[PDB]
Swiss-Prot record, chain B:
Organism, scientific name: Homo sapiens
Family per record: Belongs to the NAD(P)H dehydrogenase (quinone) family.
Protein's name in the database: Ribosyldihydronicotinamide dehydrogenase [quinone]
Subcellular location: Cytoplasm
Keywords from the named record: Cytoplasm, FAD, Flavoprotein, Metal-binding, Oxidoreductase, Phosphoprotein, Zinc
Name of one Pfam family that matches: Flavodoxin_2
Known regulation of activity: Inhibited by melatonin, resveratrol and 5-hydroxytryptamine.
Catalytic activity: 1-(beta-D-ribofuranosyl)-1,4-dihydronicotinamide + a quinone + H(+) = beta-nicotinamide D-riboside + a quinol
Amino acid sequence: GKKVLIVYAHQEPKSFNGSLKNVAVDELSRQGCTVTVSDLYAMNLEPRATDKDITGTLSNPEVFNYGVETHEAYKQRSLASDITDEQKKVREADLVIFQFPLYWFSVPAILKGWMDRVLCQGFAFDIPGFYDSGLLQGKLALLSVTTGGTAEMYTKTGVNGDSRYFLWPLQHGTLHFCGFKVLAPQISFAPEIASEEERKGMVAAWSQRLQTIWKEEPIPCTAHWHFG
Amino acid sequence: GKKVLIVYAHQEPKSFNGSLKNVAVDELSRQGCTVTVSDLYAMNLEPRATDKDITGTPEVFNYGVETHEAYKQRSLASDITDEQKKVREADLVIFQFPLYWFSVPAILKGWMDRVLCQGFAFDIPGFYDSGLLQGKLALLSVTTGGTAEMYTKTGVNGDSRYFLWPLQHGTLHFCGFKVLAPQISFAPEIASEEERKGMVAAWSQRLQTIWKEEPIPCTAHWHFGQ
Ligand SMILES: Cc1cc2nc3c(=O)[nH]c(=O)nc-3n(C[C@H](O)[C@H](O)[C@H](O)COP(=O)(O)OP(=O)(O)OC[C@H]3O[C@@H](n4cnc5c(N)ncnc54)[C@H](O)[C@@H]3O)c2cc1C
Ligand SMILES: Cc1cc2nc3c(=O)[nH]c(=O)nc-3n(C[C@H](O)[C@H](O)[C@H](O)COP(=O)(O)OP(=O)(O)OC[C@H]3O[C@@H](n4cnc5c(N)ncnc54)[C@H](O)[C@@H]3O)c2cc1C
Ligand SMILES: CC(C)Cn1cnc2c(N)nc3ccccc3c21
Ligand SMILES: CC(C)Cn1cnc2c(N)nc3ccccc3c21
Ligand SMILES: CC(C)Cn1cnc2c(N)nc3ccccc3c21
Ligand SMILES: CC(C)Cn1cnc2c(N)nc3ccccc3c21
Ligand SMILES: [Zn+2]
Ligand SMILES: [Zn+2]
């Protein structure tokens, strides 16, 4: 009995992203997994890191330090309920899948907000407690990303660089930092440009992958993996 | 007479980020430059990319498609159109922010997602050196929790150039900006009072001659070469 959280960042449910989210729900549900989806746009998730994230009185009201205050709030159990509700879902999940379109070589801001606000000190990492000793150690994470650019554009010799280069802040700087074991990324290249049958192939490939997701070895999340 | 836009993403004005923002306003103001600051948190800037960003003039909503067409029909939300005006006027755009998860805080990511729309910041074709903001300069002034030693090839975080790539190349260069070398103020929370004043003074001092700098070559070799 494995539990999966899908953190989904797309405005349109009929989108290619929406279709990949639905494939994941359908296939993981079919296997018997416990499935939860955080539909960020539908939730209107707050993305901004503010003092509204701590309920009640701050440790230092005169000089606001987001990091210090959220860490203390986590320990005193006074974080905002949107945050705590996402932390419960992550705590319980064996696998967290992130489903998003690539925005500026990164995640859409609503998803960046999830990362900034949910993955607080005391919950996702601590001193000590980062990289392999991160507080979410043992859990799996997978980035399922769609792009505007084609696969041939995302090469070492192409204008955009290797797709692996943009993965570094997400996979290493965020997910590994918090102790996640990172499964290989699912990159669905250029669905808007691809033919209908290429798009169906990409959907079929993700469906197929999901069938054996629990047998996968994670990647070695190193500078060498990302940059060669 | 040079025009500078500072896009500033910090909650507290007494922070180390607030201090670096203030030093930039003070020094550039002293020089006689025109200075505008977009204080994103104080503005409560909308970060989310939604259909509310198109203000007038379908079945399946594609943010990229609709915002591009909206930009051409002069029908983007006023927060966007106001930021675009500031960018259009600016000779230099300084981004002042603490590093959050090897990137910009979400509020600033929202500024990038929403302000730099197709037709305004780039076209296809019309990116990288053909980007629409060609002739302008951008500079990332970034603070970290991690120490400088941590941000090396043999440190736990890897080379700082590795996190700069999506921002400097993938975003700024893509829109046609020429990128001045980043100002990275490592670990002010950990530094002594003296070391901190040093880092503030180093930014102030660099700004005195910022108009004589040449931008970096925003290439893969620059970011990954060694
Ligand atoms: C602010 C911003 C920044 C961006 N930055 C970048 C960047 O840095 N790099 C980059 O490469 N790209 C970038 N993009 C482009 C973006 O990554 C793509 O537009 C996005 O990945 C497309 O995915 P989608 O789900 O929106 O596609 P959609 O437009 O929803 O889908 C494409 C097609 O697939 C169809 N479809 C849906 N479901 C199925 C199905 N089951 N079977 C077959 N077909 C189906 C849809 O009907 C549609 O015709 C950016 C876009 C924006 C708005
Ligand atoms: C969600 C989140 C994600 C993060 N992710 C990362 C990451 O991926 N990598 C990373 O390295 N770090 C990360 N951090 C840490 C973050 O980058 C640092 O906390 C931030 O950069 C420090 O800058 P600050 O302005 O907030 O420092 P402050 O705490 O404001 O400054 C430190 C000290 O300097 C003092 N000060 C202010 N002005 C002056 C002056 N003129 N002279 C002398 N002293 C002064 C202040 O009073 C304070 O005591 C993250 C933090 C958060 C909350
Ligand atoms: C919105 C899509 C129809 C295309 N698109 C939109 N924004 C962007 C962007 N920053 N980089 C790109 C790089 C290659 C191909 C497409 C895009 C792109
Ligand atoms: C006046 C105060 C309430 C804030 N403040 C304090 N010192 C300074 C300073 N050198 N430059 C600034 C530049 C812009 C805005 C505020 C300040 C500032
Ligand atoms: C230490 C120098 C920079 C002078 N200075 C001292 N305090 C201040 C201040 N609050 N605002 C300013 C605004 C513009 C230029 C200089 C200053 C300034
Ligand atoms: C080890 C800390 C002293 C600083 N640090 C170094 N790398 C990172 C990182 N990815 N996220 C953070 C989030 C909050 C606070 C510090 C960090 C951080
Ligand atoms: Zn790693
Ligand atoms: Zn570049």
